[PDB]
Amino acid sequence: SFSGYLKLTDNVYIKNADIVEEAKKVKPTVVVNAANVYLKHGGGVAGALNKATNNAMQVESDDYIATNGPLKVGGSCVLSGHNLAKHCLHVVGPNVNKGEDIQLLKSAYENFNQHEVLLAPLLSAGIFGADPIHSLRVCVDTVRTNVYLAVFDKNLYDKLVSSF
Ligand SMILES: CC(C)[C@@H](Nc1ncnc2[nH]ccc12)C(=O)O
Numbered sequence: 001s002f003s004g005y006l007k008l009t010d011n012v013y014i015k016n017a018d019i020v021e022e023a024k025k026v027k028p029t030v031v032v033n034a035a036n037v038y039l040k041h042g043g044g045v046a047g048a049l050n051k052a053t054n055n056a057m058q059v060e061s062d063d064y065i066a067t068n069g070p071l072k073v074g075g076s077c078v079l080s081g082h083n084l085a086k087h088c089l090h091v092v093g094p095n096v097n098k099g100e101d102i103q104l105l106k107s108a109y110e111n112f113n114q115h116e117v118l119l120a121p122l123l124s125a126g127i128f129g130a131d132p133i134h135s136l137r138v139c140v141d142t143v144r145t146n147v148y149l150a151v152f153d154k155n156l157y158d159k160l161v162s163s164f
Helices: 019-026 044-052 056-068 104-114 132-142 154-162
Strands: 012-016 030-034 076-080 087-091 117-120 146-151
Touching: 012 132, 012 154, 019 044, 019 117, 019 146, 030 044, 044 056, 056 076, 087 104, 104 132, 132 146, 132 154, 146 154
Parallel strands: 012 146, 030 087, 030 117, 117 146
Antiparallel strands: 076 087
């Protein structure tokens, strides 16, 4: 039910929107979370998605970490999408503010290729500290499945489109 997106490539689309509000409207098969390795959903996309689930995402995530241990930077896991989507794909992009290797951003986006269509944010951008223009270029050059990108900041959205 995706609507109002700008086509960037054969398989990549973009919209100025809060990913939480997009997930409530569309109820997609997969929503991507910008996770950390511990699945501690405090702020940014992860804190906003978790709050919209009334903390059910964090309770499920804590059980997953208690059983499996932490994810790898560049890795992912599939958990419930609760009231927002059928599934949530928690993907860990490198956090530049912590010295993590930006080359791991391509490995993070490769997780998207396991799903035919996804609603997603720009990985490693926002509070993770990487350049969003770089993140969109890695997304375009790595993901082959259909990805609908939601960018919250209007000013950044306009810059991403103009410089594409
Ligand atoms: C990742 C980053 C580039 C982006 N953040 C987001 N993008 C989309 N929905 C969101 N909900 C909460 C945060 C958020 C932004 O600052 O525009």
